[PDB]
Amino acid sequence: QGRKIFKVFNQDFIVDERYTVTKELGQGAYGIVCAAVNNQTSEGVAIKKVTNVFSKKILAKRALREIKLLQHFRGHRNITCLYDMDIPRPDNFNETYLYEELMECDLAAIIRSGQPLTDAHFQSFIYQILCGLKYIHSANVLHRDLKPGNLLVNADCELKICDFGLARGFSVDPEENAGYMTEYVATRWYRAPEIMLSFQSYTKAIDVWSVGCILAELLGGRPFFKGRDYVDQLNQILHILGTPNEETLSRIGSPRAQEYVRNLPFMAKKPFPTLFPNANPDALDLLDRMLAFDPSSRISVEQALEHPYLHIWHDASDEPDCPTTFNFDFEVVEDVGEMRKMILDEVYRFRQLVRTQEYVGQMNDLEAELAGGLD
Ligand SMILES: CNC(=O)[C@H](Cc1c[nH]c2ccccc12)NC(=O)c1ccc2cncc(-c3cc(OC(F)(F)F)ccc3OC)c2n1
């Protein structure tokens, strides 16, 4: 066997025998998560039981998407690192276990706690997000659902992005970009306006917008655009950013939406200094650029990393790109039996994988020559 069975969330939770489940962390539409310790090494881990994987084609597609994306993005300081995967009952398996780097809080909880945060905390959080996002984007992946809840934080206030279940491909080739699959809808409060407005310009700017909403939420201590539905969300965005210009207006590819926006009364932009009069002016300038209504005017991740607000943190030599782009060919598979086969392949291949000039060099070279000279 080699495994232990725990009872959590009123169901079986079957883990590697090296681990002891310590604590229930949460449950969502896709499974349940517990914290655990490696009893030998005392290392902590989050164990995620992805549940009912083959109950719906959509659940199996999401599981396979998360499994592959998590592997692609291991080894970044600001991204939750996948350590292991396991399928304890492979005969008729309807679940997969992912073993991920454990994190004590999330940014939504920290903001909820009301604990005091300094402008330096805000800078650190935004910087870390953008570093992780630069890595993800450099692989031509859009996270697509960034929000305080998926930004995990430990006691050192170190921050890591999690949850690739809704991520989406991106391509500069319009035909390819339009074919990338989007099974689930992202979180309304944080979703970029060009999406509900059918700009058809699905771009990396959609994530930058979410980062802006997060910065705004840090500055005010509460969600910035808190729409109860999409009409309400639109009205709240426009009430802050104001009537867009004719060019932006004409990019609204949805006729009811364009009609609605065009007929609204004039609305002046509400300047962010009036809304956050105690904030650092550099924070509000970067906020203004991240919450540009029109994606074409929105700051890019790399420009944001170079913004004066983050100049203390910015070290381009310390902001790596991902070595390769991620391949989304799998998402054309529509047969669940084949998705099962592919998930087994992913898990077994990953399991074997994880179980496998400078001054000194110049002087070592010179030393070897000086010893092996004459004679
Ligand atoms: C908002 N988005 C998510 O929270 C997804 C949800 C998700 C994506 N795929 C899944 C498959 C099965 C079950 C859940 C998921 N969490 C993760 O990606 C994930 C990654 C590394 C983690 C490392 N340490 C802790 C957690 C954690 C889990 C919790 O439990 C919950 F249930 F996740 F809330 C609650 C708080 C936590 O940290 C403070 C972690 N969480």
Residue numbers in the entry: 5 to 360, 394 to 412
Quote the study's own text:
Fungal proteins that function during the infection process might be potential candidates, and Mps1 (M. oryzae mitogen-activated protein kinase 1) is such a protein that plays a critical role in appressorium penetration of the plant cell wall. Mps1 plays a role in appressorium penetration and invasive hyphal growth periods but does not influence the formation of appressoria. As a typical kinase, the overall structure of Mps1 can be divided into two domains, a smaller N-terminal lobe (N-lobe, residues Q5 to E104) and a larger C-terminal lobe (C-lobe, residues C109 to D412), with a hinge region (residues E105 to E108) connecting them.
Cocrystallization of A378-0 with Mps1 revealed that A378-0 binds to the catalytic pocket of Mps1, while the three ring-type substructures of A378-0 constitute a triangle that squeezes into the pocket. Structural superimposition with apo-Mps1 shows a root mean square deviation (RMSD) of 0.311 Å, indicating that only subtle conformational changes occurred in the newly determined structure. A378-0 exhibits a compact conformation for squeezing into the pocket: the indole ring is oriented perpendicular to the central 1,6-naphthyridine ring, the benzene ring tilts about 45° from the 1,6-naphthyridine ring, and thus, the planes of the three rings approximate an equilateral right triangle. Second, one nitrogen atom of the 1,6-naphthyridine ring interacts with the main-chain oxygen of residue M107 of the hinge region of Mps1, which leads to a conformational change of the hinge and the emergence of the β6-strand compared with apo-Mps1. Finally, the last two hydrogen bonds occur between the nitrogen atom of the indole ring of A378-0 and the two oxygen atoms of the side chain carboxyl group of residue E70 of Mps1, which stabilizes the αC-helix in the “αC-helix-in” conformation (the side chain of the glutamate of the αC-helix points to the cleft). Besides hydrogen bonds, hydrophobic interactions also function in stabilizing A378-0 in the cleft between the N- and C-lobes of Mps1.
